[PDB]
Amino acid sequence: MKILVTGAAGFIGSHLCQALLKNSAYHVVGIDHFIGPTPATLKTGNIQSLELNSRFQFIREDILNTDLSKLLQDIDVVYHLAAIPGVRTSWGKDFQPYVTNNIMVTQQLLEACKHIKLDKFIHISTSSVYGEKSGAVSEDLLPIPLSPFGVTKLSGEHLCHVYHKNFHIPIVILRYFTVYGPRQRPDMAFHRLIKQMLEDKPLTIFGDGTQTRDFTYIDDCIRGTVAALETKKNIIGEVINIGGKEQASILDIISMLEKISGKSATKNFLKSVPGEPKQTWADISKASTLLQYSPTVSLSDGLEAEYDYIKQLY
């Protein structure tokens, strides 16, 4: 059967495509415009990996400049990953690209899916929609984003609900929690901290380093994402958290990188960035039930894999 992956040249999109292409039953179309925080050179590598496989078709186009009706005629499943993802660069003059690529892009894709016979429209969202909450967050918690970025992603979720209720588009929303591993975007914490450690530079810590994340290793994220397609259960209309094996503070991660590198870190403490929560912590009860999701990669093993990728990247 035939799967559209939007944002296929990106971090998570390229891994998702690779996993789907392991199944000879699946044909994959990737669409990507090469925009956002990751320079075009690293995305070119991603698409090169995918184009090794005869069952992959690459479309280098803006979704807002694509004949979506024609693109979707033979598509059975949409994975929608295309977005501008940076929590920290969504203020003032930088906000318009988030609205265009996170809101207008999602609305246009849904409009085009109204008269398609889809199995599933699997929309990728973010723990960023919740904002600041205590305890492990469940998917029925009133979300209040802290950043303009989070507002745009939550607007994308709400459009999914509008088109599902009015036009029976078979939507599934996955909320990922801080994904890491090989090919992680260069703007994210682990990529930056690892690169700084490799180059004997001070490690840049925003705030006091006590902020915590439910870090999700890429292979765990992708197992849950493929399960959203393959699950025996009816998940149409569900929001599902996809979170990681182990929660950690940035200080905890720095100690873990010291253990892997065998270097001691010089720390550069900078002012906290507006719009970032102090804690993320997913309740993955629902994923366990509906997807058989269980994250299995420990932070030590995951960080070592990313450490090896960074060391080879540069």
Next chain:
Amino acid sequence: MKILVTGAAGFIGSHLCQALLKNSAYHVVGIDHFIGPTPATLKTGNIQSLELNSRFQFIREDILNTDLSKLLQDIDVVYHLAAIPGVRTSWGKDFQPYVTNNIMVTQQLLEACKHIKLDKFIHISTSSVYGEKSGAVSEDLLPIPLSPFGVTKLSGEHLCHVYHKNFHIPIVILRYFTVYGPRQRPDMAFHRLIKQMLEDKPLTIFGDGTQTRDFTYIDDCIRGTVAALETKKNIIGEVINIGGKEQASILDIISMLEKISGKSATKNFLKSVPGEPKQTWADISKASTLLQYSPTVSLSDGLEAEYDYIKQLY
């Protein structure tokens, strides 16, 4: 103080400016680009009186193409009513203006308000953020909009929370429920049904006419809205429902119009419009507690006032 009213030439904004100008201590700056569903001719009629007043400055400019430094200089209070408000016309190509005028406008005003010291930023939102709910809805309910329009308004609310939590912008959110009376927009039900009855044309009913709304008379709406500025108590960060004296069905309303006109309605029943709930019903206990809000205008009195306005208009 000096009070900025965005959307000052519209249905609710024109009434709000007139009510503020009754107090000799208020100066009002109104901005309006004369867009959305109401033709410019009716808007000119909305503000003719206001412009004459020496404590009212009117600016006919797009908020996204204006010097917001000039606009916000020494402003103590912002009433943000500017919006594209049509529930039923926010699909397909018509979606872009809702994004521009409901999301980008709100973000640019909040960005401009960062380094000025407001008493209050009173953001007007809509019962359409709730979607399809049963019983009288309270402000703590998880909102799931049914329409692209309702998504864009809920995104504007979320931007208010982001700028409040990060930059201490003193936001207050008012959620109005189906406002009617003199100067009601020509796309709304009462304006359309009264114009049709006046012209001896068939009355257009979407679905079977058993849908109900919490109809809020304009004078009740404005009393609640002015109460949000005039209260000294800390309502900063609060979402407050503003609803009407009496809920009714469209068939109930048409009966009341028949008794006002002494004419019988010819009825055309059309398909239900995607994106509209079957019922709205406000819990106004929070407005009662925070604003001493109590709606006092009955539908028979309110409809006779609108009927009189519509007859005179045409």
